[PDB]
Amino acid sequence: KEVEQNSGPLSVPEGAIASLNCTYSDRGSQSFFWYRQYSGKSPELIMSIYSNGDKEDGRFTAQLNKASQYVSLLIRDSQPSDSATYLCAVTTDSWGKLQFGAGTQVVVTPDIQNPDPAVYQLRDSKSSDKSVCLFTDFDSQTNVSQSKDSDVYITDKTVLDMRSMDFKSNSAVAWSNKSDFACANAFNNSIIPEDTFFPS
């Protein structure tokens, strides 16, 4: 555990500063790096810093304290497109292996300005034998617990964004095939607020 980095996930809303930390153990380290890895893709270098102090580059600011062996990265003014895991990496020389930390995952939650939490039922176009419960439009604090069985499959929470109403809105989806299952008891393994609209 040569580069111990911040655990995760680290949840911040849009506009917030999302300070990240990593500590390192080789004293004679000489370059220090922050990478960004969106789920499913490859780590992308966002910040190299080479000597003590702060280095600024738009919304990012890395800090380096070689005396206490600490590299930081603060993301001033968050977009939802900053949701990734951020890997801290450290090296000694041209030829010494680059030491990656484990990663801190950062989740930028979006601004729902006036939510109305909603559950809906969707039939398909043609012929696949399961229906869908879209749980949507809700509070950014809301969990979606998948802890029922292996009969009912639920998704995770995700964020859509339209360039129209500037309308960032949350969603999750549940579905099941050969069942006696409906939408009003599909998320009762989770905390849903008392003003959620069930359909009729």
Partner 1 sequence: GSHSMRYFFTSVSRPGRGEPRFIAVGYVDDTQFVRFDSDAASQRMEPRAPWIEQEGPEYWDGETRKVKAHSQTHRVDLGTLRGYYNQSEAGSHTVQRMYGCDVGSDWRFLRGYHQYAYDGKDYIALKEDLRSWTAADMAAQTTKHKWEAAHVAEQLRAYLEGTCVEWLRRYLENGKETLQRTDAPKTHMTHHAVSDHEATLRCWALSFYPAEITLTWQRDGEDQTQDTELVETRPAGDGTFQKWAAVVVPSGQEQRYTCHVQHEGLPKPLTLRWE
Partner 2 sequence: NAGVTQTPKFQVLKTGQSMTLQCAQDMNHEYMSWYRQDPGMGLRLIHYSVGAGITDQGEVPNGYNVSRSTTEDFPLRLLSAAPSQTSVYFCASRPGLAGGRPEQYFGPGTRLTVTEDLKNVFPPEVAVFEPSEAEISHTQKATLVCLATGFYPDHVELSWWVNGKEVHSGVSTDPQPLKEQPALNDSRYALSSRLRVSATFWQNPRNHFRCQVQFYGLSENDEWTQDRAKPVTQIVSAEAWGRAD
Partner 3 sequence: LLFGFPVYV
Site for partner 3, rule CB under 8 A:
28, 30-31, 91-94, 96
Using alpha carbons only, what angle is made at residue 45 by residues 40 and 50, rounded to the nearest 5 degrees? 150
The answer to whether residue 118 forms part of the interface with partner 2 (CB under 8 A) is yes
The answer to whether residue 163 forms part of the interface with partner 2 (CB under 8 A) is yes
Alpha-carbon span 1 to 25, nearest angstrom: 9
Residue type, 57: D
Paired with 24 in beta bridges are: 3
**What is the nearest approach in angstroms of partner 2 to the Cβ of residue 70?**
19
The answer to whether residue 164 forms part of the interface with partner 1 (CB under 8 A) is no
With b for 16 or more beta-carbon neighbours within 10 A and e for fewer, the 91-114 pattern comes to beeeeeeebbbbbbbbbbbbebee
The answer to whether residue 94 forms part of the interface with partner 1 (CB under 8 A) is yes
Residues numbered 62 to 91 that lie near partner 2 (CB under 8 A) are 87, 89, 91
Residue type, 81: S
Alpha-carbon span 32 to 92, nearest angstrom: 9
The answer to whether residue 51 forms part of the interface with partner 1 (CB under 8 A) is yes
Question: 179 is in the binding site of which of partner 3, partner 1, partner 2, none (Cβ under 5 to 8 A by kind)?
Answer: none
Q: Dihedral of CA 168/174/180/186: which sign?
A: negative
Q: How many other CB atoms sit within 10 Å of the CB of residue 200? A: 4
The answer to whether residue 76 forms part of the interface with partner 1 (CB under 8 A) is no
Phi-psi region at 77: left, alpha or beta (left = phi > 0; alpha = psi -120 to 50) = left
The answer to whether residue 93 forms part of the interface with partner 1 (CB under 8 A) is yes
Nearer to partner 2, 27 or 41 (CB): 41
Nearer to partner 2, 27 or 123 (CB): 123
Residues that bind partner 2 (CB under 8 A): 30-31, 33, 35, 39-45, 48, 50, 87, 89, 91, 94-95, 97-98, 100-103, 116, 118, 120-126, 128, 130-132, 134, 136-137, 150, 153, 155-156, 158-164, 167, 169, 171, 173, 175, 197, 199
